[PDB]
Amino acid sequence: PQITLWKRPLVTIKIGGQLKEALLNTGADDTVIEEMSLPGRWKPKMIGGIGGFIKVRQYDQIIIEIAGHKAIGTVLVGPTPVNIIGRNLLTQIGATLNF
Amino acid sequence: PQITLWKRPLVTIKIGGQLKEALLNTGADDTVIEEMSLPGRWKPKMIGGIGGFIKVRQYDQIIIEIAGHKAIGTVLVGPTPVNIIGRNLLTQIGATLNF
Ligand SMILES: [Cl-]
Ligand SMILES: [Cl-]
Ligand SMILES: [Cl-]
Ligand SMILES: [Cl-]
C-alpha cells in the first residue's frame, strides 16, 4: 500500500497470538509494544526520546505480522503509550518513505 | 527520493537561514526542533513522547525547507533529543509510506 500521512499511520499487527493496533514509526529505531507476555528469554533495556527514558524488556527473534506481512526481529515490551513498529521491522516489510 | 529505513532517515533542513539535520518521523504528529531563535510570537503547547510530556514553544507559519522541498507551517521548539519533522510538514512535502 501507499499510506498518506494526514492521520497517524496505524495498522493491525499480530504478535504473541494477539491482534493489536500499532503506529508505523520511522522515528523509532526499535519496535516497542505495550505490556504483554512473550515466550523465551529477555533482558532489560532503557529506551529514550521526548520526555526521557523508559525501562523495557528486550525479546529477540520474535515473529510479528504487520498489516499482513510477516517479519522477525527484536521486540521491546514496556509502558509505551502507543504500540510502535520501528525501523528494525519496517525494513523487513520493505517500507520506504517517498516524496 | 525513496528512502529506506536501515539507517535513521536524516535529511538536511533550512530554517532561520541555518542548515540543520532532522529526522523524517511518521511517528510524530508535529515538528519539533532544538532550541533556536525564530521570529514572531509563540503559544504554549504540551507534547507527549516515549518518556513523558514536555512543554514546548509553538511558532506558527514558519518558513522551512526540508530535503529541498519548501514548507511553511507550525514549528515547535524545545528540548527534543533530535530535530524531528512530523506529519504536519511531511504532508506539505508530499511524503508517503510505501510497502
Ligand atoms: Cl492493517
Ligand atoms: Cl519506566
Ligand atoms: Cl531486530
Ligand atoms: Cl502546520
DSSP characters over A19-62 = EEEEEE-TT-SS-EE-S---SS-EEEEEEEETTEEEEEEEEEEE
**In chain B, which ranges are continuous DSSP H helix?**
87-90
- Measured between alpha carbons, how far is B61 from A35 in angstroms, rounded to an integer? 39
Domains and CATH numbers, chain A: 1-99 (2.40.70.10)
All 3 cell numbers of residue B72?
Answer: 511553511
Nearest Cα neighbor of B52 from B79, B70, B71 is B79
Technique used to solve these coordinates? X-ray
Contact at CB, B91 and A32, closer than 8 angstroms: no
Residue A89, φ and ψ in degrees, nearest 5: -105, -25
What is the least distance, in Å, from the CA of A47 to any CA of chain B? 8
Q: Which ligand is the nearest neighbour of the Cα of A9?
A: 1
For chain B, what's the residue count? 99
Q: Do B79 and B34 contact (CB within 8 A), yes or no?
A: yes
CA distances in angstroms from B59 to A92, B55, B84, listed in the order given? 37, 13, 15
- Type of residue numbered A34: E
- For residue A54 the three cell numbers come to 523508559
Q: What's the burial of B43, exposed, middle or buried (CB within 10 Å: 0-12/13-18/19+)?
A: exposed
Task: Report d(CA A36, CA A87) in Å as an integer.
Answer: 21
Give CA–CA dist A77/A36, Å, rounded: 7
Q: Which amino acid is at A42?
A: W
Q: For residue A85, how far is the Cα from the chain centroid? A: 3
Angstroms from B17 CA to nearest CA on chain A: 23
Q: How far apart are CA B10 and CA B12, in angstroms?
A: 7
Amino acid at residue number B37: S
Residue type, B85: I
Cell of B82: 533530535
- Flag if B26 and A47 touch (Cβ within 8 Å): no
* Header resolution in angstroms: 1.1
How remote is the CA of residue A61 from the centroid of ligand 3, in Å?
7
Q: Which residues pair with B57 in a beta bridge?
A: B44, B77
Whether B61 contacts chain A with CB within 8 A:
no
Q: How many Cβ contacts (< 8 angstroms) between chains A and B? A: 134
Q: Which of B82, B98, B90, B81 is nearest to B10 (CA)?
A: B82
Q: How far lies A73's CA from each of A40, A51, B37, B40, in Å? A: 13, 26, 41, 46
Nine-digit cell string for B86: 512530523
User: Which amino acid, residue A90?
Assistant: L
Q: What count of Cα atoms within 13 Å lies in the side-chain half-sphere of residue B42? A: 17
Distance of alpha carbon A80 from alpha carbon A54, whole angstroms: 8
Amino acid at B56: V
- C-alpha cell, B49: 513522547
